[PDB]
Symmetry: D2
Amino acid sequence: RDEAGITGTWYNQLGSTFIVTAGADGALTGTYESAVGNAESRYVLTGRYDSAPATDGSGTALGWTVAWKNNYRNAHSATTWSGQYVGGAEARINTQWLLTCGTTEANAWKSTLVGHDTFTKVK
Amino acid sequence: RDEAGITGTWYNQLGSTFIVTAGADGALTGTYESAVGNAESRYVLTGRYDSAPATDGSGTALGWTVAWKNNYRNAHSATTWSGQYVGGAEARINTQWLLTCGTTEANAWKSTLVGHDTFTKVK
Amino acid sequence: RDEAGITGTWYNQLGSTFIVTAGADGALTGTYESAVGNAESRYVLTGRYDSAPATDGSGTALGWTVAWKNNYRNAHSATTWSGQYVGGAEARINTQWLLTCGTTEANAWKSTLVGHDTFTKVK
Amino acid sequence: RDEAGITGTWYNQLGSTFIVTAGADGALTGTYESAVGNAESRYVLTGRYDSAPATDGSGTALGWTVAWKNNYRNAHSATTWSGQYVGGAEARINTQWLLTCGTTEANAWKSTLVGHDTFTKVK
């Protein structure tokens, strides 16, 4: 169980900062600050994680959401990251993500970006 | 603003049930019960949504996460749905989703499923 | 084996037309005309399919690519559809797709759209 | 135009080998050998690429498909990679991919894996 491992400040390859607390129950709460896109300052995030992972060297599944609205901007969009926490000398959170924009029904086909972020405790 | 529109009980094409409350602030809280997979009964969900969408007929971006652990099972996985709420006579939540399993670093390549769920207020 | 089942003219939910020949060997060749986006007229497509599927009622895996350049336009992008052919009274090709735009390394994070198309022999 | 840049032997982070020829017209033809999964030896691949990319430092969009059937195995599946070729001292092909298995209509929800491969000319 990785409540301790997860909780803290994480940085991705784009220079984004994800600050999270992991609850005993499975909760994830925090703030996200994106280095790119139509974003400034911190945005609320929430999510979930597996509080009793397999003990066989598997990763810890988890995910979280950011809606890109805060007191400064509203980018009419939401990203969800789905992935796994891997512990040990160089801990990582390896994710894939889906960003959906609010669109008209005619432009729905082009509503959703897909990418992959890797989070580390350093840089 | 679709706090009212979102809040409630939603059903997808697989026969799953998503029960959600949308907060004034952007919060989503609730429970998910999957008709398929390594799942039984209700699982906690949390997420976010755009509480002040565009007024130009665009959808309302949102997302949420379920970690597949509850008092009955632990499937060592998490799904995130990213999508948009569309209001009006036949309201829908149109999503794409990422399901990550906890895996060894050797099997990480096969950790993540992708699909699409459409939620309605009826069936 | 669905060489016969696949070959022909298919229409998706956006009103696009996919014309394909399936070879005995696994080849797919054809043309795609998109109802949406930065596209006009026909574009070359190529792909592959499983020429000896399982006989247990499973679908037939397949995929194909379109690069969005032809004599009329160049949208500096490529879509790949991955999915399965399901035969029988109402045959379908159920796909998920990835559209990558050519971008600068700074905008790479926003290079890739994800969606889902369902192809039928009618409409 | 990157006919020359693309053509050749490429290696990904899993230790897979992708051997490709790029045609003047936009064609990609070749063979793929996977380091992982239900695969052995070479499999046919085909695809497309943008033969006249933007000259503004953008990448070259492209994609390709492998159906996982050859003389040795049939894994009743197909992968499509969608991405972009980036040229220059350390050329890369940055991809995201969708792997669809042939499934029953009941298991269709779990038919499709998503991941990301980065290809280089060395290792």
